[PDB]
Amino acid sequence: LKAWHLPVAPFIKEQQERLMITLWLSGDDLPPRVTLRAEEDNEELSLPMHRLRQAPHPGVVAWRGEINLVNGQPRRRYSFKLLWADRQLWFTPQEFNRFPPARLEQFAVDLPDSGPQWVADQVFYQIFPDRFARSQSRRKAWDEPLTAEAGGSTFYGGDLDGISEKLPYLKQLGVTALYLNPVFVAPSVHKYDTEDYRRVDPQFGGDAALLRLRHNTQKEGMRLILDGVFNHSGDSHAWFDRHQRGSGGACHNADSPWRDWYNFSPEGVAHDWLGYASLPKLDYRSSTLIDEIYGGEDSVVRHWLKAPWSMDGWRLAVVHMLGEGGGARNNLRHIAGITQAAKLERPDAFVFGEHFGDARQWLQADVEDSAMNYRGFTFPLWGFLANTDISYDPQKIDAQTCMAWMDNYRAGLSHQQQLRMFNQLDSHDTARFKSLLGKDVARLPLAVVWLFSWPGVPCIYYGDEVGVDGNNDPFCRKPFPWDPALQDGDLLDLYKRMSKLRKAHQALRYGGCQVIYAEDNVVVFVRVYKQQRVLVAINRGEACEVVIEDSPLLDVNGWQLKEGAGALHDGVLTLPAISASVWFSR
Amino acid sequence: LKAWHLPVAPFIKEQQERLMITLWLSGDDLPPRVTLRAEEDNEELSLPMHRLRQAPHPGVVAWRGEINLVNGQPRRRYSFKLLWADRQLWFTPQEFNRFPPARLEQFAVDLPDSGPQWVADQVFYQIFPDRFARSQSRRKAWDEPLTAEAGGSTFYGGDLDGISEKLPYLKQLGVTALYLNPVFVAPSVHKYDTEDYRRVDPQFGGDAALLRLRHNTQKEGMRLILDGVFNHSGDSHAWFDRHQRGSGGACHNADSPWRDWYNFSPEGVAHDWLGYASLPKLDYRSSTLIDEIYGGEDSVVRHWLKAPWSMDGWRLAVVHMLGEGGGARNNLRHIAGITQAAKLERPDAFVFGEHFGDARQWLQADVEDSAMNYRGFTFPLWGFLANTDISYDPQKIDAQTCMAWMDNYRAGLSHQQQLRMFNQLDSHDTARFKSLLGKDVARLPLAVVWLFSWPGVPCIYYGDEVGVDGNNDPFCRKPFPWDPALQDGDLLDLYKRMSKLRKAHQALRYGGCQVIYAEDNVVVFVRVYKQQRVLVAINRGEACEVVIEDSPLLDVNGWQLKEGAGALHDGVLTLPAISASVWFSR
Numbered sequence A, B: 001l002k003a004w005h006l007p008v009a010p011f012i013k014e015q016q017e018r019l020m021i022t023l024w025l026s027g028d029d030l031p032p033r034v035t036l037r038a039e040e041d042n043e044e045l046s047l048p049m050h051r052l053r054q055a056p057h058p059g060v061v062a063w064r065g066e067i068n069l070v071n072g073q074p075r076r077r078y079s080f081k082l083l084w085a086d087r088q089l090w091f092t093p094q095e096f097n098r099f100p101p102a103r104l105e106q107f108a109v110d111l112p113d114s115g116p117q118w119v120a121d122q123v124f125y126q127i128f129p130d131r132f133a134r135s136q137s138r139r140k141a142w143d144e145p146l147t148a149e150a151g152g153s154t155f156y157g158g159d160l161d162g163i164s165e166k167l168p169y170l171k172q173l174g175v176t177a178l179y180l181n182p183v184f185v186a187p188s189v190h191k192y193d194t195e196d197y198r199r200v201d202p203q204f205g206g207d208a209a210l211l212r213l214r215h216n217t218q219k220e221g222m223r224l225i226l227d228g229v230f231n232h233s234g235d236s237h238a239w240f241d242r243h244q245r246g247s248g249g250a251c252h253n254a255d256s257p258w259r260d261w262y263n264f265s266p267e268g269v270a271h272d273w274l275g276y277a278s279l280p281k282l283d284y285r286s287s288t289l290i291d292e293i294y295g296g297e298d299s300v301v302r303h304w305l306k307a308p309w310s311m312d313g314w315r316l317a318v319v320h321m322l323g324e325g326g327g328a329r330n331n332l333r334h335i336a337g338i339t340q341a342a343k344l345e346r347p348d349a350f351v352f353g354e355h356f357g358d359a360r361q362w363l364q365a366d367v368e369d370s371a372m373n374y375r376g377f378t379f380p381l382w383g384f385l386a387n388t389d390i391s392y393d394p395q396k397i398d399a400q401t402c403m404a405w406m407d408n409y410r411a412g413l414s415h416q417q418q419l420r421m422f423n424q425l426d427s428h429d430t431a432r433f434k435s436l437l438g439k440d441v442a443r444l445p446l447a448v449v450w451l452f453s454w455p456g457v458p459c460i461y462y463g464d465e466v467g468v469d470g471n472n473d474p475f476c477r478k479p480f481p482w483d484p485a486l487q488d489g490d491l492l493d494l495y496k497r498m499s500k501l502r503k504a505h506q507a508l509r510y511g512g513c514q515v516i517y518a519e520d521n522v523v524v525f526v527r528v529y530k531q532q533r534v535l536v537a538i539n540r541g542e543a544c545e546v547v548i549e550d551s552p553l554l555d556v557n558g559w560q561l562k563e564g565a566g567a568l569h570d571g572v573l574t575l576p577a578i579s580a581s582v583w584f585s586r
């Protein structure tokens, strides 16, 4: 028995306030009935399906049903209940299930989609401003080695006009969207110890440099996302003012105008971020704090989204811990509130959250558009390709396990959510992925191909594309090497080619995703959008041949190889050692 | 490799604001390190564990760690990360996992537990008031057969003083808590078409009869839960007033004081419950509607919870669809609001929701205490024992699948949530389970044993205990046969004995639950609380012998058989055909 379905054309078609749903089946004991299990306002529905007279592909029987769209919430969840005389079987994002799937692990399509539809067309690039580029006309020097000493106090001098001036490089790289680390007034170099949410830190060029950057990116058609740090302030902020270098500080004034914006124990110690005293945690019980951060018309969240700043959204730092009373009490309401405020100021605003852990409860409640997809994308690859994980603990997973992991996670997400998940191989909070591969550094191009072809929006971490390496923070924030002698020019070109493949093909931006093969060293999946197919074959080990069973998903006119040295012929994949290949259908 | 852990003593112990956590391991290639993956305010933690010098059982190595309780939210989620030099493996509620478990499918213990701790000590009994008992001093006659005609208009005359008068029968049955179907003024016999939330329907004896019932149950130490129907009103309610048999109705007055409490289309048709025009749906966008239902001090939810009514809580009818704008928009906020209001009036109030489907998103967000556990308890048994399901579609699942199903569902719930899940074999909205067994009716006692020994609180559906049967509503609401000639007296006695076993043994009220064996016809599980063990063996088919491997969970002084004709000796279970046995440890 075989089944196929993806939450996208050719399997679904919207027509006259109905969502038509098509299931493919093949095999020797097909169910004489199939029920479309759908859902309206959380009520499970049993919708009849009927066989189509015409086979869509050789040996395949298509069943078709219909979801009425006029009622019910935008997110439409569904699965397939195959019925024989004596038994039943479910078809799900995670293949066949002998007992019913979880409601939150069904196929899901958001209709209407009120999310930021532009995100799926982007290539993102994350910039740690101090370490990217100095402007022409502007404390360590650029070539001085990064050391473990005083990580938070060492400034190399990168600034925002440096980014503006490097926009032609980013354009040629294929970048269409920037995510900046914090830029607001803060004493440190990473600047997550915020001192003024209302001003750009002059060390990066002040408010004028960020306005120029906003103008310049608009001119080039590039989106711009700011780092929003709202779980905690810095202890130098006027609200907290630990060093009494001002008046009215919550820290040393029981009568401060912001005494209730922080939580102090019966010992006097304020609650902070994971025991970092420089980062006192904000108490979202306070109705005045809520108004200042997101509630009011000129709250911090909306401020940088309205003119003149007109930012395209917010990365939410430590989104999972924000809440009341010193911890994450009422976390989901407040993150929903932040997102709601942002979409009020800008309906197409992108709001994604930093989630090192499992983001599904946040995303399944729709309190944010997306997450930094560490759990669903990054760590599976650290495991499969680099033998490591979030804690740098040894990891030994084969392709079966890696794809069970990746597919299980996204089964909790609608198609539209999957398409805008924020995927990267590393960040300012992890060791460089190049370094993590260790002796297996020749696998790095596999990961770059995978980054641009797995569902979600890819984000290059500045410098990855030219081969910078280093261990975890502090050593992952090296100055970007602008000397081509210090650049991996071959790696740069692969990044260029992948972003070109992405712009070129709708399936890599909008397409469903079906894992076709996943055994030991080899992963094969296909992206699927209308008649278009994109086949990707990853081999982390030595040369091998793999038979691909006839799949109606792969029944095309022909395949044109676009990247890598793999060869597909008569259902046999010839894959060189440590390779990734991408075929486009003809 | 083997592992054991349950979210209860002997595996966990709270001491000096720390939660101590113990893992059992056995096998030939044990991990030299184990990390306790815990969570504080949603931040994943890596806590070290250390081997205990003393083996807790032969061949078992114990690791122990510690969760700091002074910070973080009440619900403490955790799992075990076994680490070797080259690889890792997770231990979870669902056995070993090669990739990390979902955050919401870990072990979880609620500390402090702010839920209704009395629920786990209860035996519930659900009464459909018209069909239970007529009072001594009071339209069909009691012995007239139930027909398909005019189901909603046929009254047999049961009333609340009938229940009061039958309290000695319920006491002897072992019942400690009642759940009543709706009793408020409504035209129908089931009375889910509410006309007045503020008055008891005189057909059941009016307000005086319910006060007597509240007094009488208090006198007998019995709890009392009312059916709260807040997703929709009846169309005869004054607010809606479809038949203009009053003034000010939302239905026929664009200026009604409650026009905004209902949602009308640009056609004039109000939104209702699943196309039943007699049940117009309430619009929880309205700030005045929110205040009347749960927001205000004398709102409907709090009204029946304060004196003189002093009810113990609310069953929430159609809890999953309640929301704004004609559908389930903002459903979770409003159900949280209802529960919050109830616990404000009565801190130990029990609020559970009607969930035919998958309740996990509601329970994982803690918007309610519990659910009618159709998905986690009822339908697995309909499948395993009666070959059917929610849609009365054929079902063929063996013990492996049934227990994978039951254990997967509860893995999404903390220990405390599992203990108060509202388990029943049938209800006023399903065919009688006795009828569903069809030719396999001899399996009915297996299900009764299972109802009283699976985690959760059992609820007898009135008449089940004496063998009434019938198909789905209308035929599942027969008049209760008070003639002992029409009663299955042997079935009645099993119910009595099971509720006695439950009162007698802490493990059946508080205990963890570990499935030990689940192959084909046979299910074996053990409830576990401190040194106490309760072993349950269910065999749905012919006589068989089953070997039980040595389990440290089963290493006790001895076993005393308490119910059924099974025999345990030297790791061999001798199980008669179609049997259920319960052993208590010695």
Ligand SMILES: C[C@H]1O[C@H](O)[C@H](O)[C@@H](O)[C@H]1N[C@H]1C=C(CO)[C@@H](O)[C@H](O)[C@H]1O
Binding pocket: A190, A192, A273, A276, A316, A317, A318, A354, A428, A429, A473
């Ligand atoms: C605020 C934190 O969470 C956010 O979400 C950022 O993503 C992180 O970078 C993170 N750390 C910042 C703060 C500290 C702590 O002292 C430093 O250790 C880091 O270098 C620095 O970046």
Ligand SMILES: C[C@H]1O[C@H](O)[C@H](O)[C@@H](O)[C@H]1N[C@H]1C=C(CO)[C@@H](O)[C@H](O)[C@H]1O
Binding pocket: B190, B192, B273, B276, B316, B317, B318, B354, B428, B429, B473
């Ligand atoms: C309101 C509904 O949901 C609640 O939650 C109850 O649990 C159900 O019983 C259910 N049905 C009631 C209403 C109708 C519909 O016309 C009748 O069909 C039923 O007989 C009657 O009981």
